[PDB]
Design a protein around this nucleic acid. Sequence first.
RNA 1: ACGAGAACAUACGUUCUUUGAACCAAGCUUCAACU
RNA 2: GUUGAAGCUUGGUUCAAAGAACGUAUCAAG
Lengths: 135, 139, 243, 214, 214, 309
Amino acid sequence: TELKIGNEKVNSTNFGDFAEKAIRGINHKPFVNSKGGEQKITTSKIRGILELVNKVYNRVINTNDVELSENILADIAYIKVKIAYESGREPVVKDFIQRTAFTAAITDVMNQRTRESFLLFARYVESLIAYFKFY
Amino acid sequence: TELKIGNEKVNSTNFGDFAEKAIRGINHKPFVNSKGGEQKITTSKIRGILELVNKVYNRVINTNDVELSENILADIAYIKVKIAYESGREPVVKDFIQRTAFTAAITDVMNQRTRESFLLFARYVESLIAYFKFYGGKD
Amino acid sequence: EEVEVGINRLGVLRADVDNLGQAFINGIPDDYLSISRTATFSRAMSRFFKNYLNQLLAEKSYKINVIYAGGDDLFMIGAWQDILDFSIVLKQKFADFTQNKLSISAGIGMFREKYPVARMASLTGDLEDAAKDYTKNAVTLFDATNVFSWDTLENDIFVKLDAITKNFEKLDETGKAFIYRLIDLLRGVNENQQINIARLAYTLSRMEEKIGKTFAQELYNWANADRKTLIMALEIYILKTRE
Amino acid sequence: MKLVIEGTIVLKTGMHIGGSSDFSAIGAVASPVVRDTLTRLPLIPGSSLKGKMRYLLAKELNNGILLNEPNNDQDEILRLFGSSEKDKIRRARLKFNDIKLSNLAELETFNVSSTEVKFENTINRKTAVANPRQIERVIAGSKFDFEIFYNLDDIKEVEKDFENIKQGFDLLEFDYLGGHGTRGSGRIAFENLSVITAVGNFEKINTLNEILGA
Amino acid sequence: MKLVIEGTIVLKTGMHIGGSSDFSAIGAVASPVVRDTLTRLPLIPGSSLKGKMRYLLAKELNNGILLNEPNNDQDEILRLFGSSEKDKIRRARLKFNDIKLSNLAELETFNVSSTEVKFENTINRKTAVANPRQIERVIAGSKFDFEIFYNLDDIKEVEKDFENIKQGFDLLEFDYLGGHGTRGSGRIAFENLSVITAVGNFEKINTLNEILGA
Amino acid sequence: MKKTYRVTLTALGPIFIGGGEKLKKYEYIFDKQKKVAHMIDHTKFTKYLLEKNLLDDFTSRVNSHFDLYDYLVNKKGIVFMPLVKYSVPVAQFMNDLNTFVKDAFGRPYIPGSSLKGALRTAILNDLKEDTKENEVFAHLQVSDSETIDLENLKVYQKVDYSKTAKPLPLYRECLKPNTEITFTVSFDDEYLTLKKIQNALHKTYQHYYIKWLKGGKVGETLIKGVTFALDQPSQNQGEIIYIGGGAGFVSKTLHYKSKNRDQARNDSFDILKQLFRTTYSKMRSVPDNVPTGKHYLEMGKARIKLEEL
RNA sequence: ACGAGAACAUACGUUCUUUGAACCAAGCUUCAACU
RNA sequence: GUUGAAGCUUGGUUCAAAGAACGUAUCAAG
């Protein structure tokens, strides 16, 4: 219930508000294009990010063990390499991964190795989808 | 037991008439779509919002303490982000939430963080269901 | 055991005449007095009570036993379905006997059949004494919480019982679990109000295709307007539709 | 001379029991399980268990049918559960007790609440249209630690009384306990049955404790 | 006595069933499978099994059609499943249980889960605008041990009662059980059906067992 | 009276049913240039990676995006391949694969809802008021398939022939043609028969031919793929079906009923126009070819075998 | 050497009976920025 | 000639209406 991501703590009370203020920061200084101009992350990229999390979430949710499976931590590493691929593909997903501390959260999920930490990470990510679709 | 949501303070004496007035303001001044026509919020999504509240309202009933546990507040913050997400996809439910303020009510629940405040919120939301079905709403 | 229609309960009645003590403090004044005239009033009242009540209970074949008779003492015991509707015609007969001058305070309660009659008489005399000071014309129905004036009783309840009986006997799949649920949400609105009125509006909406597109509107506006005279109306409908 | 029938009841399915039938939310779960209003533990009354024990024994101590009133049925059942005739009245040698949930902490180690809501519906044959009901029932695997008082007065029938209460328990093992049982709820199984004296040790508690702990 | 019907239910495909009582991700499966609330195993409720075999039996016992009410249908079907008609209440002779999953041991030998997720969508036939949804359902090859209690009270009708509970099982063999059955889910099968007296031994237990395992 | 049918789909052209899993270049695929594609494990691969310090190819994906398919594996000194679940061959003319729908045991099958939606496309072909509340399709009791072996899978790439066969970079693993997979459908004869589904399948294929493939063949079209046969009149009564493998816009929406140059006009402009594009008569096709010339099989197509019991 | 002394509102009793979380939904539509 | 070019997302429905269930019989009345 901690997720000390890079600088601070988001618990299971304000994960939505943290996603809200993160996205609120995004759509007030949107990423200036490398060719000059403005763009937003599109819905399909951010939806693929959510589906990429929720493939693992479906396997995690129905197992009561607070210890995450050793197979699951491998899939969390695969989340890391998939967002690395997409993030290296385009700059808009690069700083969307940078700004919302996605890699920091996923490393802290490796570090804690608890189900509830992953569940609150998935809580956070679906709140990112929620407040992105709200704007 | 106060919950000043957007314009008034709703205790356990003046919320059902407020929900009645808000819905009566909806079904006589309805939402005009961005396509040309008139759009009313469907029964299925407002009921989806209703049992979205209810699946933690069933846990708040069997508690004695007033300060709710972190499990309950986690589910409340989840309800808030789901209200935002379903609100984001279609604008009809978006200004249903913005017009009858769930979001201010639910964040006042997130501020007071007390059992009786969430019960008052739950009675407010179900009374919105009630007077939505009653005035104008097909049965 | 003759009344195999409603709830197997026995009702008793206590009553007296309103404002009778002031009627004898200053009976007839000086300027329009002969001696003989004020005696005719009291003998007319007494003979009205004894002879008229005996004849009235004879002509409509009531299952009512009688103990007292008088403007201060009246005690009858009988089936509740027969002394509840005897109270209104008692009110009418003493009203047009007095030519709408002297009225009735009455008290009616409902009792188990195997019950000590001394306890019944004390409890219903005290029940009437709750309705007596309310003097004013009034009858209380089985408890001190239900005290109604005579016009309120007659008009309000006996049309909001006649409407309930007229409508719910037309329906083969509403009576009477819906009436019990409607009673349960109606008797509990006294402490918390907008919750029960909202659930009431929702559940009147959801029966509006069965109980009627009109009938739910009168149930809603009656529950908003005069709901103490409908909770007793549904209660006595339930009691007279038992078994 | 005055004994305590201590054991437990485990839940293998379901078991919705009790319940104020006033009104839920629009909302939510209809017909909740009755709980202890103090501790918010769902409990079985003494009345539910005693009525189910007396119903099944009077099917077996007949043998078979039961189209009877609770009073004029038997001798070995009236001896145990009491009667209320005008002159053939027998004081109830049993005393049932309210039985609250005991292994709440063991459910908390599995991190689930002590009850669930079960979504059920009904399909009309005319229209294939649902009718959803939400029924709150306790979870399976909850243990109900219980104690039933047996106020001994006659010695020549203790063994018969305890062996027929044992067959009452193992007869209730093959039936539900309250609520929507034939729809698959309420199946119970009894464990660690034992009887222990009030003060001191009475006599022949070993024969009773072996006919009970069978 | 009392008859305990024991067999097992293998799944041939799918079996999405129920609906929780739990939060769903944005994400992922809404309408998940109905599970045990304690051990998180999937279960088919005995109510759902009862509803489908009751519907299929009441359908077949007329001619293959029905539009009546559950309390207004055949005498045999009320004799098995029970009624609540205001004059005659036939007490239900059958008694189902919730059937939680049994072969989690061998399904973990394959290192598969207990349930799958079904990605399945809707295509607008005017605009070809898709709409996806995710459905959780149980992995085919799962075996459920079920147990049915039957109140042995008559002798003349038990062979009649076990000829059409067998026929009810055989009718539900050719049909689905719960959820999206007309789209290819919930196909079941039955095997190792055995009847065993709970206490004692009914003498006509052999002719029931071959009318059961036929 | 609940007539049950052993409906078998002979694959008359490769068929995709999908399942919602996409794979990129690094994603699992060992597309060696021996005309083969191996998909590998998710858990054992990653487990072997972090047991030999996954940060190496975590960052050497960063060094080698885009092209890194096996050159990472075959030149990192561990060429080992038990990690494959199963192998399929490939049809080109390198990346972005989405796989077939599997069971839990990783053995593919055609789900029953796919055939039911295909039949629903091929039944309610009249004017689109037949909808969610259609009472006919409450009786089609279709089942999931027999679980077909992995051997019939081979990955085909997306190619479109609008004016020329243009190779799109999407790949999808499909059932190789003339693979037969059975079903179990049942329906009440009071609502639909063998004859109704038979004739409705026949005239859906008739309309799909005579209004899009006939017009798509009288427009600029050769016999260049020599093999993309027109092939109705021998099996025009043989009632060919299109199930959902990228078979086209027309194979899903119903409105080639009634006429051509109104409905083809409105969809092939307007419904495309809400997407991005501006083009005339006609709507433009979706084939898939295989090798020594090519063969150009039309995509997502099968033939029904309605046999009773 | 209290209108008093006694004197358990007690005994009997299943919140229970009947009810499928159902119904309708092809992971799919588009070919393209790209000598 | 070469190279992933990506965009669209449970929309859209429907809901405890359930039906029975507040209720006996023991001291009083005669």
